[PDB]
Design a protein around this ligand. Structure first.
Ligand SMILES: Nc1ncnc2c1ncn2[C@@H]1O[C@H](COP(=O)(O)OP(=O)(O)OP(=O)(O)O)[C@@H](O)[C@H]1O
Ligand SMILES: Nc1ncnc2c1ncn2[C@@H]1O[C@H](COP(=O)(O)OP(=O)(O)OP(=O)(O)O)[C@@H](O)[C@H]1O
Ligand SMILES: [Mg+2]
Ligand SMILES: [Mg+2]
Lengths: 92, 465, 28, 191, 500, 53, 207
């Protein structure tokens, strides 16, 4: 992950206090697909919750980001919004 | 806040905002532009830049040009004051009669009615057209789709339905011209002037017109149908009225969506379509419905590119409609007008417990006779009529009489032909087709069955010969 | 006027060729 | 986010992102000239010995050996902490193969920061004495105050005569060869 | 003599090398040039290259500008200097282009000298709306008997000429151009019409022959030939219909009437397909881009009939489509059929049998119809259309009754009557008289092989000692039953005089 | 028509050899003093464009 | 100038010039191969490199090998000395009868004639063959298109066309064998020698 904020905090050695192991921030959102930075302890096919209350599922676990399919309208999701992993796969 | 244009490609304008980003579907007004260039936000690109589709031409746009966020989506005037007026995609009046002075506005983007706001009433709407009222009957409140190619006749069928239904309706009417000829819109406007449905001198107009035609850029053609939907939704919900919504045609909306899909950086779908064609058509079509607050009867024309029914846009539109009227070029080559395919039109009102047992049995008998004739046509084209048996000759003769009797002279098509248009009651339709199916008219020539309304005109034309 | 030297030189060469052609009687 | 002069140039790419981050880091502190001169010395040392560049741009070798070699050759240059952290960041993301680009991108900065605009003058033959100084006087009036001229001179006999002058924003082809070429083209296409 | 022209060309070739914000060609290939620089350039803006070529700035990317080159790509190298012109792509327009052959950019290629144009108009102009448009009511007289009777064309209408190769599409278009000489030489300025012929993808010899044919018939004085031949670049073939449409839009917006012919739009769509495939755009139906419908629709929507408040002008389009094996179910023909108001289909089968023009009456229709015809022509064409419909109904099965044989003979005589020679269009009065003689049963005793000779001799007889008949027809504007009886008597007298 | 074609051919030949001789003489017309004058004029024009900022 | 080969894949050769680049459709000669290898420029890839297509095989091409641009497209010898001789694409004599020793050379890439230069009127080429003259007459400056092969007398027909055009009209002929089999090319060459179209003794050869 090479974004301007990450490069800024890695040159200066900021070591940010946001523990992205159990949460994450949205890199990009479009057409029901959200690329999320963070969620280090996420697992494949796991449900997540967005800041607007919408749900999502993690389908791609890339070394750079996480690919989330959005269970609803993507207008409620914004770049940089907080995503919290539920810790469980989808159940009915 | 205030943004600046950072890219212009086709009808797609990328604008960069400094402080705050406008939301998706928000309308942005370009500053320094005379005829109100309005851009609708489609996606947030990132780095405080958003991507918009223009509702007009993008010529003369320079980079860094100021654009202003309106803080709301495209709002269009709704109410009794929009009746008799012509509006463009952004709701501005284009009939040169002054501004639309109303107090009520509505956004052209709205969520669909929920599953609990559904009505299941199925009452037959009588159109006066024999092939419609027999094989694929229309429902009072519901979606009707006229599928047809280039030159097979859909505007004529639209105008015939307006003449036969909209004048003797009582409730209201909305016409939405989507990507069609501006000559057609001018002719329909003057037709409604002459017929009294629009009053230029006073109130009590019954039809509101919204026009975005094929000369418009693809951004304008992809949103004008939503503007006509918004007028009909206000007339249905906030007034509780029965609304007639005519759209011509839906394929221009779903094609203008595909023209900008490559410029939005999307992977194309099969046969070079937009990958969100189904979802965009779903969100558009689900707003057209009959609710518990009010009723909407919608007639939509659909264009099939290159006379193909397996194209993804008509194949998607098929599942969103109640009654379908498929028009075929081959039937129009045979001189039968309207060129409705009898074996390709479905209604879902064609049920023996809804439209009557006799009406259902006659319609299924006609469809079986025409299917048998279609199966025999392969042997007829090679070995001729001599090899056929006597029952096959009776099948062919009755099917040809049925095909001629399905044709009907239309009142709006008289200028094309000269025949007086005939309005056929549905009881006369089922009586005439029951007479043909029973073999009571086998002694008459089939030319007497051509371009006549009732079966009495068949007998009169046969006696004239 | 800001006459370019190349344009003036071209005009001088054209006038020179015309005078020489008159001296040559219009021959090539 | 990053506090700087807000992009004195328009430099793009991932290498442009690295160069702008290094410029922001070296302008928040007072180490901009130091990091510029040690990057110039590092680029000179890489161009001096191509074997070092082949060692850095070898996917077979591990990144720990690459960063050890980078630190070893930065100790002898008496580098600062900022360029050491910049090179460690470059070798952490396996982007040190484009180490020539970022330095060149860093050479693209400190031209607008110092006001130096690149000018290129091409002549039919190289000239001096009456030339050069008057060209500098003419080019000095082409700038707003606070900017300087970095001039590169070229010679080419194929342009017959005249001068080819290019600045960082505009171009002028006021040369004898192109003038007579377009005049002969006009005479052929008209007469 | 020559030296004065040389001095004028030298004095007019002022370089004026000042300011000139420029860019550098990063790479050249496939007809698209990437340019680094040109920060303040506009979309669709015309630029000039260092070699004298011109281009259109298509893509406004951040780090480069993608420019579509109007010419060959061997004249542009890497690192060339691209200068912006400051104007969106425009062509010269005016009455100075009448009698001239120009390329897609407006540069004359006939060697007649410069065009003294005073105004330029852009090629990407939007079409008029509902309010500045009125119904098509004035007739467009192509001079073809079958077109003027059965598939009429009005001024402002878009009428398609569609058929296979070597079927007479260009012949119909050139005859339509030639027929306007009688209107242009007359005094009525309202009936004068200015023609534009756009040759796209044709051979250069064919365009030279067309220009010679227009010069011999003196139809060149009101005709502009826009040429983009088969050896030219694909962007020039794409640009030429829009350049010609802008030249016709000049007359449209100035209260004049213009007829424009695009021969042919299928080759323009092939050139645009080449441009899109070299731009790596996604192919669709038959590997064509998805905006080729928009390409033809934005071209043909500019041909329309204006209102009286807009000057009363008009622009008439005659697009040409070349089909393969007579298929009108292809993508491009179905697009142009859906755009235009009607078509004139040409049959290869009728062309092989000597029926020229090979117009398929059953497939060629016009949605305008009665508003695009004069009163006498409409009165006789309704009966002609009904009789040809009856003939096609009775000849489909008869492959007999006295009435059926009479209808067959009448339809055969009408079919032989509608045949017309090339490059000789007829005035509307001559066509009205000819169709009147055919419809009213005056050819019942005449063999179908002698209809042409009868037509020529009857035309000579009417022009010789029956000028008062033409004066009465022009004064009344139709055929009264009294003049109908007089015409029947003089036709009977003429046929008895010819043979007795 | 023969007289017209003969005169047009002679005019075309005269134009072609005049253009070629003009090109050759222009390539022979360059003197170092005029080259210095043209270089000074180009420098003055460049300075005048520098004034027009 | 002088360029160096930087890539070889198949018949595609990337050559880098550290100088002014040759234009598109320009001919380059490899300076190491003993057979004359010719490369033709297709596009400018950037960074002073060009992409070329080879007119012969690329077997022992080494990276950095010197390549000389000819300053022109592929130039071939032209003239009456080409009649009766077989030359390859690059004009080298392939009939093994020595050099062609012409004084005139012409580049194979050229523009079409302009609009003014076109012939307004059409004319018929006679060719002296009755069925061709009557039913399907040829046109001067036109393309005909010959259908049918194997044993239909195509070789005799084209040799008689050469003979009749040279005997009546006086113009010569050129055969361009594009992708032809080497066996069929040898058969046609010896048939033209045998039929008198090609003369190996005097200068009366016509093709
Ligand atoms: N009921 C009818 N009676 C007579 N002619 C008809 C009838 N319906 C259609 N036609 C003929 O078909 C033509 C095409 O009609 P229309 O313009 O309505 O077709 P369309 O399907 O809307 O075409 P497009 O898709 O190109 O708009 C008419 O102009 C007329 O010639
Ligand atoms: N009415 C006519 N009478 C006689 N000959 C005609 C007529 N119409 C066309 N022709 C002849 O038919 C031939 C082909 O016509 P034309 O070139 O106009 O067709 P086209 O469809 O444009 O062909 P292409 O596909 O080559 O452009 C010509 O030789 C022309 O003279
Ligand atoms: Mg229609
Ligand atoms: Mg043609």
């Amino acid at each position: 992950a090479e974004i301007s904020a990450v490069l800024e905090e890695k040159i200066l050695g900021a070591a940010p206090k946001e523990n992205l192991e159990e949460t994450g921030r949205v890199l990009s959102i479009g057409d029901g697909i959200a690329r999320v930075y963070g969620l280090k302890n996420i697992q494949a096919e796991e449900m997540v919750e967005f800041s607007s209350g919408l749900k999502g599922m993690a389908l791609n676990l890339e070394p750079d980001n996480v690919g989330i399919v959005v269970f609803g309208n993507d207008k409620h999701i914004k770049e940089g919004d907080i995503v919290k992993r539920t810790g469980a796969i989808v159940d009915v | 806040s205030n943004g600046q244009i950072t890219a212009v490609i086709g009808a797609v304008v990328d604008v960069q905002f400094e402080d705050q980003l406008p939301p998706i579907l928000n309308a942005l007004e370009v500053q320094g532009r005379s005829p109100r260039l309005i851009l609708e936000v489609a996606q947030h690109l990132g780095e405080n830049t958003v991507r918009t589709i223009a509702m007009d031409g993008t010529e003369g746009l320079v980079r860094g040009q100021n654009v202003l966020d309106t803080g709301a989506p495209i709002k269009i005037p709704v109410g009794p004051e929009t009746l008799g007026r012509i509006m463009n995609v952004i709701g501005e009046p284009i009939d040169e009669r002054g501004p639309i002075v109303t107090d009520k506005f509505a956004a052209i983007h709205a969520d669909a009615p929920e599953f609990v706001e559904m009505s299941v009433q199925q009452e037959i709407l009588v159109t006066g057209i024999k092939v419609v009222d027999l094989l694929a009957p229309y429902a009072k409140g519901g979606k009707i789709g006229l599928f047809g190619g280039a030159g097979v006749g859909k505007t004529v069928l639209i105008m015939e339905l307006i003449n036969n239904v909209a004048k003797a309706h009582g409730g209201y009417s909305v016409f939405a011209g989507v990507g069609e000829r501006t000559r057609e819109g001018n002719d329909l406007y003057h037709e409604m002037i002459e017929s009294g449905v629009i009053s230029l001198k006073d109130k009590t107009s019954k039809v509101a017109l919204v026009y975005g035609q094929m000369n418009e850029p693809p951004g304008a053609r992809a949103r004008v149908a939503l503007t006509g939907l918004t007028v009909a939704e206000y007339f249905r919900d906030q007034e509780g009225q029965d609304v007639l919504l005519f759209i011509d045609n839906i394929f221009r909306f779903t094609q203008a969506g595909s023209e900008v899909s490559a410029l939005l950086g999307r992977i194309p779908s099969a046969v070079g379509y937009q990958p969100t064609l189904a979802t965009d058509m779903g969100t558009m079509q689900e707003r057209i419905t009959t609710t518990k607050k009010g009723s909407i009867t919608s007639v939509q024309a659909i264009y099939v590119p290159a006379d193909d029914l397996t194209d993804p846009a008509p194949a998607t539109t098929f599942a969103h409609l109640d009654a379908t009227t498929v028009l075929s070029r081959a039937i129009a080559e045979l001189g039968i007008y309207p060129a409705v395919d009898p074996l390709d039109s479905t209604s879902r009102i064609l049920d023996p417990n809804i439209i009557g047992e006799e009406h259902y049995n006659i319609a299924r008998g006609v469809q079986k006779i025409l299917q048998d004739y279609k199966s025999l046509q392969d042997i007829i084209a090679i070995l001729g009529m001599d090899e056929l048996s006597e029952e096959d000759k009776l099948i062919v003769s009755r099917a040809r009489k049925i095909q001629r009797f399905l044709s009907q002279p239309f009142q709006v098509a008289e200028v094309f032909t000269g025949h007086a248009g005939k309005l056929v009651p549905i009881k006369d339709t089922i009586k005439g087709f029951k007479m043909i199916l029973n073999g009571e008219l086998d002694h008459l020539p089939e030319v007497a069955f051509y371009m006549v309304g009732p079966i009495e005109e068949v007998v009169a034309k046969a006696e004239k010969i | 006027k800001a006459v370019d030297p190349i344009q003036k030189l071209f005009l001088d060469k054209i006038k020179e060729y015309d005078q020489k052609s008159k001296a040559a009687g219009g021959k090539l | 986010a990053t506090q700087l002069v807000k992009a004195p140039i328009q430099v793009f790419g991932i290498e442009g992102r690295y160069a702008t981050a290094l410029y922001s880091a070296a302008v928040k502190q007072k180490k901009l000239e130091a990091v510029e001169k040690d990057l110039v010395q590092l680029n000179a040392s890489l161009k001096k010995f191509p074997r070092l560049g082949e060692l850095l741009k070898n996917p077979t070798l591990s990144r720990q050996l690459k960063k050890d070699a980078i630190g070893s050759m930065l100790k002898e240059q008496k580098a600062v902490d900022l360029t050491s952290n910049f090179l460690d960041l470059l070798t952490e993301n396996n982007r040190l193969k484009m180490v020539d680009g970022v330095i060149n991108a860093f050479k693209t900065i400190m031209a607008a920061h110092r006001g130096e605009v690149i000018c290129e003058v091409t002549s039919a033959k190289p000239l001096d004495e009456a030339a050069r100084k008057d060209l500098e006087v003419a080019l000095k009036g082409f700038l707003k105050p606070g900017q300087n001229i970095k001039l590169t001179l070229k010679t080419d006999p194929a342009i017959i005569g005249g001068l080819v002058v290019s600045i960082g924003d505009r171009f002028v082809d006021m040369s004898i060869g192109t003038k007579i070429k377009r005049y002969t083209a006009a005479l052929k296409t008209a007469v | 003599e020559i030296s004065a022209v040389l001095e004028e060309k030298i004095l007019g070739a002022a370089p004026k090398e000042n300011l000139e914000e420029t860019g550098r060609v990063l790479s050249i290939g496939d007809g698209i040039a990437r340019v680094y620089g040109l920060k303040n350039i506009q979309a669709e803006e015309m630029v000039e290259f260092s070699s004298g070529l011109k281009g259109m700035a298509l893509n406004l990317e951040p780090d480069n500008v993608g420019i579509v080159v109007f010419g060959n790509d061997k004249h542009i190298k890497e690192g060339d200097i691209v200068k912006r012109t400051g104007a969106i792509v425009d062509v010269p327009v005016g009455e100075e282009l009448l009698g001239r052959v120009v390329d897609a950019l407006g540069n004359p290629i006939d060697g007649k000298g410069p065009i003294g144009s005073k105004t330029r108009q852009r090629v990407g102009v939007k079409a008029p709306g509902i309010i500045p448009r009125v119904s098509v009511r004035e007739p467009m007289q192509t001079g073809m008997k079958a077109v003027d009777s059965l598939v009429p064309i009005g001024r402002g209408q878009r009428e398609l000429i569609i058929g296979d190769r070597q079927t007479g599409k260009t012949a119909i278009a050139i005859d339509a151009i030639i027929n306007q000489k009688r209107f242009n030489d007359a005094q009525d300025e309202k009936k004068k019409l200015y023609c534009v012929y756009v040759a796209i993808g044709q051979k250069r010899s064919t365009v030279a022959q067309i220009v010679k044919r227009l010069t011999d018939t003196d139809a060149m004085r009101y005709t502009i030939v826009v040429s983009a031949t088969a050896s030219d670049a694909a962007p020039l073939q794409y640009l030429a219909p829009y350049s010609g449409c802008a030249m016709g839009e000049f007359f449209r917006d100035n209260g004049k009437h213009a007829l424009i012919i695009y021969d042919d739009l299928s080759k323009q769509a092939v050139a645009y397909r080449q441009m899109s495939l070299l731009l790596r755009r996604p192919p669709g139906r038959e590997a064509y881009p998805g905006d080729v419908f928009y390409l033809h629709s934005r071209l043909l929507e500019r041909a329309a009939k204006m209102s009286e408040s807009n000057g009363g002008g008009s622009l008439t389009a005659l697009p040409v489509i070349e089909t393969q094996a007579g298929d009108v179910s292809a993508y491009i023909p179905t697009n142009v059929i859906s755009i235009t108001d009607g078509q004139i289909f040409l049959e290869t089968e009728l062309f092989y049998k000597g029926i020229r023009p090979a117009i398929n009456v059953g497939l060629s229709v016009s949605r305008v119809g009665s508003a695009a015809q004069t009163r006498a022509m409409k009165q006789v064409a309704g009966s002609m259309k009904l009789e040809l419909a009856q003939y096609r109904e009775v000849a489909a099965f008869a492959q007999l009754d006295a009435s059926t044989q009479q209808l067959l003979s009448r339809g055969v005589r009408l079919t032989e009557l509608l045949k017309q020679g090339q490059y000789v269009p007829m005035a509307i009065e001559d066509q009205v008289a000819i169709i009147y003689c055919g419809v009213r049963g005056h050819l019942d005793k005449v063999e179908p092989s002698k209809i042409t000779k009868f037509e020529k001799e009857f035309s000579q007889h009417i022009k010789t000692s029956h000028r008062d008949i033409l004066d009465t027809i022009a004064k009344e504007g139709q055929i009264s039953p009294d003049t109908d009886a007089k015409l029947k008597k003089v036709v009977t007298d003429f046929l008895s005089t010819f043979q007795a | 028509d023969y007289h017209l074609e003969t005169e047009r051919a002679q005019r075309q030949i005269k134009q072609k050899n005049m253009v070629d001789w003009i090109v050759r003489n222009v390539m022979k017309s360059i003197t170092p003093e005029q080259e210095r004058l043209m270089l000074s004029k180009c420098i003055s024009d460049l300075k005048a464009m520098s004034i027009k900022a």
